[PDB]
Amino acid sequence: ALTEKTDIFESGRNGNPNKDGIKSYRIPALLKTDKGTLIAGADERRLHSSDWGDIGMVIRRSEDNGKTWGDRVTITNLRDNPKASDPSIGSPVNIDMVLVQDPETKRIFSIYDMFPEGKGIFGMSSQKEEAYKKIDGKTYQILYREGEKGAYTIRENGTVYTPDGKATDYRVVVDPVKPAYSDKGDLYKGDQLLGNIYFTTNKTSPFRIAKDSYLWMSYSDDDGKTWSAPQDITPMVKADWMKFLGVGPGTGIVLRNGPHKGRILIPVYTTNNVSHLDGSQSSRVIYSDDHGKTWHAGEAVNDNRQVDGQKIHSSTMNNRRAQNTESTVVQLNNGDVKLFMRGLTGDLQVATSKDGGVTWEKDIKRYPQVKDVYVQMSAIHTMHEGKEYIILSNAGGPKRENGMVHLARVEENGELTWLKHNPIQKGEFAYNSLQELGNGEYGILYEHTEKGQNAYTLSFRKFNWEFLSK
Amino acid sequence: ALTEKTDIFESGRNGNPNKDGIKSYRIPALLKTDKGTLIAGADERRLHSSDWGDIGMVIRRSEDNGKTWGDRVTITNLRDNPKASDPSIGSPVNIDMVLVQDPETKRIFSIYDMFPEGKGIFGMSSQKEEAYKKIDGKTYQILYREGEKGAYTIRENGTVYTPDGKATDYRVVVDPVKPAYSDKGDLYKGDQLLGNIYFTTNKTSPFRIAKDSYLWMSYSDDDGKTWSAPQDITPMVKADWMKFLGVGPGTGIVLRNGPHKGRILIPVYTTNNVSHLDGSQSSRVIYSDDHGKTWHAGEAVNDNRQVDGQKIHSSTMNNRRAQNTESTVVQLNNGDVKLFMRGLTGDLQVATSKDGGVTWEKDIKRYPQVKDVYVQMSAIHTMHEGKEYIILSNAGGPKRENGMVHLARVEENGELTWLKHNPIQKGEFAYNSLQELGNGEYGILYEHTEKGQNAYTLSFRKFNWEFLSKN
Ligand SMILES: [Cl-]
Ligand SMILES: [Cl-]
Question: For chain B, which residues make up each domain, given as ranges?
Answer: 1-130+211-471, 131-210
How close A32 gets to chain B, by Cα (Å)?
35
Question: Would you tell me how many other CB atoms lie within 10 Å of the CB of residue B354?
Answer: 17
Q: For residues B46 and B20, what is the distance between their CA atoms, to the nearest angstrom?
A: 9
Q: Do A272 and B273 touch (CB under 8 A)?
A: yes
Amino acid (one-letter) located at A185: G
Pairing of strands B250-251, B93-101: parallel
B128 CB within 8 Å of a chain A CB:
yes
**Collapsed DSSP state (helix, strand, coil) of residue A316:** coil
For A240, which of B127, B241, B361 is closest by C-beta distance?
Answer: B241
Nearest to A470 by CA among A417, A421, A416, A402: A421
Nearest residue of A to residue B306 by CA position? A149
Whole-number Cα distances in Å, B209 to A75, B141, B153, B157: 47, 8, 10, 17
| Cα B359 to ligand 1 centre (Å) | 26
B-chain CB neighbours of A304 within 8 Å are 129-130, 149
Chain B positions in Cβ-Cβ contact with residue A274 (cut-off 8 Å): 273-274
Q: Would residue A129 show up in a list of annotated catalytic residues for this protein? A: no
Q: Of all helices (H) and strands (E), which one includes residue A467? A: helix A465-468
**Distance (Å) from CA B92 to ligand 2 centroid:** 11
Q: Residue A145: nearest ligand to its CA? A: 1
The whole-angstrom separation of Cα B274 and Cα A239 is 16
Distance from CA of A173 to the nearest CA of B (A): 26
Q: Nearest 5°: phi and psi at B157?
A: 65, 10
Radius of gyration of chain B (CA): 22
Asked if A272 lies within 8 A of B272 by C-beta distance, the reply is no
**Domain spanning A1-130+211-470 has what CATH number?**
2.120.10.10
Buried b (16+ CB within 10 A) or exposed e, A199-230: bbeebebbbbbbbbbbbbbbbbeebbeebbbb
Beta-carbon contacts of residue A154 (< 8 Å; ≥ 6 apart): A140, A141, A142, A143, A160, A161, A172, A174, A197
Give the whole-angstrom CA distance, residue B31 versus residue B444.
Answer: 10
Using DSSP, state whether A122 is helix, strand or coil: helix
Rounded to 5 degrees, what angle do the CA atoms A347, A448, A1 make?
Answer: 80
| SS3 at position A368 | strand
**Could you give phi then psi for residue B422, rounded to 5 degrees?**
-120, 125
- Three-class SS state of A437: strand
Distance from CA of B312 to the nearest CA of A (A): 6
Phi, then psi, of B270 in degrees rounded to 5: -125, 165
**Count, residues in chain A:** 470
Write the DSSP assignment of A386-407 as a string of letters: SSEEEEEEEE-SSSSEEEEEEE
Chain B contact for A276, CB < 8 A?
Answer: no
Experimental method, per PDB record: X-ray
Question: Which of A393, A387, A380, A389 minimizes the C-alpha distance to A432?
Answer: A393
Residues B424 and B401: beta-carbon distance below 8 Å: no
Listed resolution, Å? 1.8
Q: Tell me the ligand closest to A81's alpha carbon.
A: 1
Q: DSSP per residue over A32-82, as a string? A: E-TTS-EEEEEEEESS-SSS-SSEEEEEEEESSTTS-----EEEE-PPP-T
A128 in reach of chain B (CB within 8 A)? yes
For residue A466, give the 3-state DSSP assignment: helix
Cα distance between the two ends of chain A: 10
Query: Is B128's CB within 8 Å of A274's CB?
Result: no
User: What is the DSSP annotation of A149-218?
Assistant: -S-EEE-GGGEEE-TTS-EEEEEE-SS--SGGGTTTTEEEETTEEEEETT--SS-SSSEE--SS-EEEEE
Question: How far is Cα A78 from Cα A183, in angstroms, rounded to an integer?
Answer: 7
Q: Phi then psi for A88, rounded to 5 degrees?
A: -60, -30
How far apart are alpha carbons A453 and A294 in whole angstroms?
Answer: 41
- Helix residue ranges per DSSP H, A213-282: 234-237, 276-279
- Residue B68 has φ and ψ, to the nearest 5°, of -110, 155
Nearest to A149 among B240, B304, B355 (CB): B304
Q: Hey, CA dihedral for A181, A182, A187, A191, is it positive or negative?
A: negative
Q: Which residues of A touch B313 (CB under 8 A)?
A: 127-130
Cα B205 to Cα B78, B116, B160, B171: the distances in Å are 17, 15, 13, 11
Query: Looking at the complex, does the CB of residue A273 fall below 8 Å from at least one CB of chain B?
Result: yes
What is the CATH architecture assignment of A131-210?
A: Beta Barrel (2.40)
Q: For chain B, say whether A149 makes contact (Cβ under 8 Å).
A: yes
What totals of helices (H) and strands (E) does chain A contain, helices first? 3, 36
Q: Give the phi and the psi of residue A124 in degrees, each rounded to 5.
A: -65, 145
3-state secondary structure chain B: CECCCEEEECCCECCCCCCCCCCEEEEEEEEECCCCCEEEEEEEECCCCCCCCCEEEEEEEECCCCCCCCCCEEEECCCCCCCCCCHHHCCCEEEEEEEEECCCCCCEEEEEEEECCCCHHHHCCCCCCCCEEEECCEEEEEEEECCCCCCEEECHHHEEECCCCCEEEEEECCCCCCHHHCCCCEEEECCEEEEECCCCCCCCCCEECCCCCEEEEEEECCCCCCCCCCEECHHHHCCCCCCCEEECCEECEECCCCCCCCCEEEEEEECCCCCHHHHCCEEEEEEECCCCCCCEECCCCCCCEEECCEEECCCCCCCHHHCEEEEEEEECCCCCEEEEEEECCCEEEEEEECCCCCCCCCCCEEEEEEECCCCCCEEEEEEECCEEEEEEEEECCCCCEEEEEEEEEECCCCCEEEEEEEEEEEEECCCEEEEECCCCEEEEEEEECCCCECCCEEEEEEEEHHHHCCC
Ligand 2 centroid distance, CA of B203 (Å): 4
What H or E segment, with its residue span, contains residue A462?
strand A457-464
Nearest to B313 among A127, A272, A362 (CB): A127
Contact B14, B459 (CB under 8 A): no
Instruction: Give how far Cα B213 sits from Cα of A253, A265, A312, B55, B243, Å.
Output: 39, 34, 18, 16, 7
* Top-level class of domain B1-130+211-471: mainly beta
Catalytic entry in A326, A336, A388, A428: A326
Catalytic hit among A51, A117, A232, A299: A51
- Is the link from the previous residue into B398 a cis peptide, with omega within 30 of 0? yes
